[PDB]
Each structure stands twice: as structure tokens, then as C-alpha cells.
Amino acid sequence: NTGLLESQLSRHDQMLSVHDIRLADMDLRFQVLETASYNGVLIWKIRDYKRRKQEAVMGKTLSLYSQPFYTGYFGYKMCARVYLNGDGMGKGTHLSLFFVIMRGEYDALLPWPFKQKVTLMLMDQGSSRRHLGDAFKPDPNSSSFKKPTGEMNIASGCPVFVAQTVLENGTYIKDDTIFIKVIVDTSDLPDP
């Protein structure tokens, strides 16, 4: 009857596999949850700069995106996308940094297109704290600030945020880690 024993064993094994995926998926979920921000500001910590940058060049991982952050408990859902080895006109020469609108559970109640002012910036871990950054007001005609249809809209930002040379030779990187900060203006919003 080992067939029966074996069948049962087989079933259990499949279950344990599912369980392992279920579990891992939750570790991820916890992580995202543990780093959520609802005031429209994001502080994204990227560890392993060297290794990651290399994965960029090689092309194993051209970009990285942050956990999601919000303008409020029930507001716009957004995240950041970075390219360690550059994108577009800055590929191979710059670090590209973009803003991303994601499909939020409450999009139906939020104003569109997205018109909140976004401020992209790379923090200087140096004692002078001369953080690099740039702000812009969404272009009302860009399909990037359109009411989401897919999980996330087309990212918008600066392909040439910083020269890779400037970066690596400045005091922005420290302990093989960098910090990206995004600031979305929420004042504009009347009383969402």
C-alpha cells in the first residue's frame, strides 16, 4: 500500500511547497508594510550599491523600484524607479531617477491627471549634507500622470539626474548604500 503512503507523502510535499511560497510572500508583504509612508514623502534605502550597480551594467537588473508610498491613508499610490547605470540619454553615464504613479485602491476618488509637485533627490550622507535634488510639476498631458489602468504608469523623471562620476566620487554613497528621497506635495489637495 506504499502507493497510498506515497500518495499522501506526495500531497503533503506539494502543500509544504505552497506553504513556503506563502510564507516568503508574507516576509515581502511585511517589509513593504513595515516601510509604508502616508505623508507623501519617501525615503528609499538602497543597500549593496557596488554589487547592484554591476548588475545594472551587466544587465541582470537595469532598474530598481521602491516600496510604495502614499499621499495619505487613502490617497495616491506611488513609488520610485532608479537606474544605477542610467537610462535614456544618461545610460552608462548617469544614475537615472524617476517617479511612478501606481494603481491605487482609491483612484476612483482621486483627481486626475495627477498634478502634485514631485521632488526627486539623492541624499548626501556627507557632513555637509548637500543633497542633490530636482522638482517639477507633472505635465497634464503625460500618460504618466493619467488615471492608472495597469499596476503602474510610465515613469517620469530625470535620465540625467547625476553623473555616475560625480556620484561615486562624492559623499552620497556610504557603507555601500545610498538614500533616495522623493517628496510629493500634498498641500494642493483640498481635503482628500
Partner: peptide
């Protein structure tokens, strides 16, 4: 002050921790 569309090159990866 004008957003510049990014190339959805792919090879993306969620990284936060």
C-alpha cells in the same frame, strides 16, 4: 520642471529593507 519619460527597459527588481 518637465518630467522626462523613462525607457521601460525591464530587468527591474523591488529593493527595500
Amino acid at each position: 520642471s518637465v518630467p522626462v519619460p523613462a525607457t521601460e527597459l525591464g530587468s527591474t527588481e523591488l529593493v527595500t529593507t
